[PDB]
Each structure stands twice: as C-alpha cells, then as structure tokens.
Amino acid sequence: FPEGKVLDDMEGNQWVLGKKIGLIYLAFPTNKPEKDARHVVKVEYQENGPLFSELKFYQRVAKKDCIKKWIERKQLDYLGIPLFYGSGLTEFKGRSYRFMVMERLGIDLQKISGQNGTFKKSTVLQLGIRMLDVLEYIHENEYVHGDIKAANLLLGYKNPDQVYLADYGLSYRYCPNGNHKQYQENPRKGHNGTIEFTSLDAHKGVALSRRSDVEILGYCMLRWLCGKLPWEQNLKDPVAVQTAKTNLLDELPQSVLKWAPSGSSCCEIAQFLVCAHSLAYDEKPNYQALKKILNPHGIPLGPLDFSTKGQ
Numbered sequence: 001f002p003e004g005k006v007l008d009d010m011e012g013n014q015w016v017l018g019k020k021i022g023l024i025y026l027a028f029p030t031n032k033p034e035k036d037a038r039h040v041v042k043v044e045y046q047e048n049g050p051l052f053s054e055l056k057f058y059q060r061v062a063k064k065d066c067i068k069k070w071i072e073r074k075q076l077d078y079l080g081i082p083l084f085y086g087s088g089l090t091e092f093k094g095r096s097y098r099f100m101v102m103e104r105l106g107i108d109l110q111k112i113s114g115q116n117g118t119f120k121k122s123t124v125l126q127l128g129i130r131m132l133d134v135l136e137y138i139h140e141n142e143y144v145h146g147d148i149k150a151a152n153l154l155l156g157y158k159n160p161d162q163v164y165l166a167d168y169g170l171s172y173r174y175c176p177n178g179n180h181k182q183y184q185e186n187p188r189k190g191h192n193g194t195i196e197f198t199s200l201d202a203h204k205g206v207a208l209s210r211r212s213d214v215e216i217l218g219y220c221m222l223r224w225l226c227g228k229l230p231w232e233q234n235l236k237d238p239v240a241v242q243t244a245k246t247n248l249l250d251e252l253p254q255s256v257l258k259w260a261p262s263g264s265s266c267c268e269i270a271q272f273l274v275c276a277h278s279l280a281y282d283e284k285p286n287y288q289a290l291k292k293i294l295n296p297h298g299i300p301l302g303p304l305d306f307s308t309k310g311q
C-alpha cells in the first residue's frame, strides 16, 4: 500500500497511510493531523477472518467513553485495551481489503524479554494484575481473549510505561446477551490457541469461557518467571501438552512450587493457578482475590522493570 493512500472508514472519516511497520501502517487523520502519528492501520484481506473477529471485539468492547467510565469507577490508572477509531474496506489492485484504525502502540514484550523469555518477578506479578484488569473488563462485556502471551502484550507509544493486551484474533463472545455458552467438547476442533499457553478447555475443543483466560494467564506468568514450562519439549505434540497441563493443575500447588529456581518463589503463581482451577465452566473469576494473590502487600504499581543486569 503506498504511503499517502487515503482510506475512508465506515463513519466517513478519512485516514492517510504512513510507513509500514498481517500488514500494519502508521496512519493520520486527514483533518487536524498531528506532527506525529498516534494511530495505526491494520490491513488484511476482506476474507481475512481473524481481523473480522478483532473488529467485532473492538467495535463492541473498546468504547472509549465506556472504558473511561469504568477506569474512573474502578480507580484504575489505565486499562490495557488499545483504542479503536474506525474500520472499513479499501481496494488495491482489484482486491478489497478490510482495515481497522487502532491506537498506536510500542514494542511487544516478547522482544524485550530477558534470558529465555523471562521477566523480573515484580514485573511478572504486575503484568498479571494489568491483564486481570483487561480480563475483568472484556469478560464483563461478553468476550474472552484466548491468546494471552508475551508477543500479544505491547507497551504504549504515547504512554510507554503502560501495557496493552492486543490481538483479539481468537477472541470469543462467550455470553452473547447474557446467554453463557454451553459446555460441549468438540473433538473435531481441539487444540486451538497458542499451544504453549492455551487452556485445557481449548485442548478439549470446549468453547472458551472466563476460566480459560485466567488459566492461560497463569501459564504465562509461570513461563515469564521460571523461563520454560514443563512441556517446553512437547510443543509440536498438542496431546502431550494437554497431558502435561492436566498433571500440573492436578498436582497443585506442589507442581508449581517445585518448578521455581531458588531465587523466585512461585507461591503467588501457585495460589493463582489454584484459584483458577477451582472455577466451574460458567463461573465468574474472583478478579479481586486474584489481583491480591499477585499483590499481597497492596503495593502501588509502578514502572515495569525490564532491566537485564548481569545476564
């Protein structure tokens, strides 16, 4: 797509592409463009199906003013959901592409991870809390993410200290108009998600519900703290991963307590996974209890620490 190509979204706002960075470009509004881009445009084929799933999520859930009301009521410094500005179709060389105009963000956490994709314990716990805030909000709004992992956490651009959950490509409306999906194992559609982190429900082909996002976040924090998960050697074998995950949850808390090196306790992560595994399929997580598990002293959250000293 040429720099300067002008996109018109469904609301009739016009967007001029910048430089590429699927395909993702800097973007500016035609009307009152700032020096510096605060928007990006994500582009994919119209048939491109994950972008459409994303569009549904963002259009339904990422309402700037609703988030603003939530942040204020819940006393959050921020919520790690990127803002959504518009969507539409554009044509280039005979084909029609769907695009979404999104808040500009910075670097993904996979890139800025230390030794063997690890973060300092304080950073792990804070990331967990920030994600619980996102989960509570999207869950309240009938959606689950299904794919929390470092590559889908991005730091802000305009605010580089804030962390954002992105890529709602596997997001799922689990409770459309308050009707919670039924539990059904589909043995034709098992083992979806990122195999390293996906939930047992996903392994069994069960429609994602709230507990699955909490479970996945638990696997993530264990991976971020300890540096590799018990199934590291099994990733090309989904069944074996399922088995390893089953055993880990079945043998909590010790499965997790034992895994940790002498430095970094998994006490918080163990109890987190205990809480997560206690949930019924249609059950609402105790997000406040979970946040407290990760922040036992109730410290204010401060800068994320990505330092690498000595490695």
Ligand SMILES: CC(C)(C)c1cc(Nc2ccnc(Nc3ccc(CC#N)cc3)n2)[nH]n1
Binding pocket: 021, 024, 040, 082, 102, 103, 104, 105, 106, 107, 108, 110, 150, 151, 152, 154, 166, 167
């Ligand atoms: C390419 C770059 C990372 C510099 C980036 C991303 C954004 N902004 C937004 C806003 C909403 N959704 C997305 N998707 C998204 C998710 C993850 C990655 C990277 C990995 N893994 C890229 C894009 N991006 N601005 N700049």
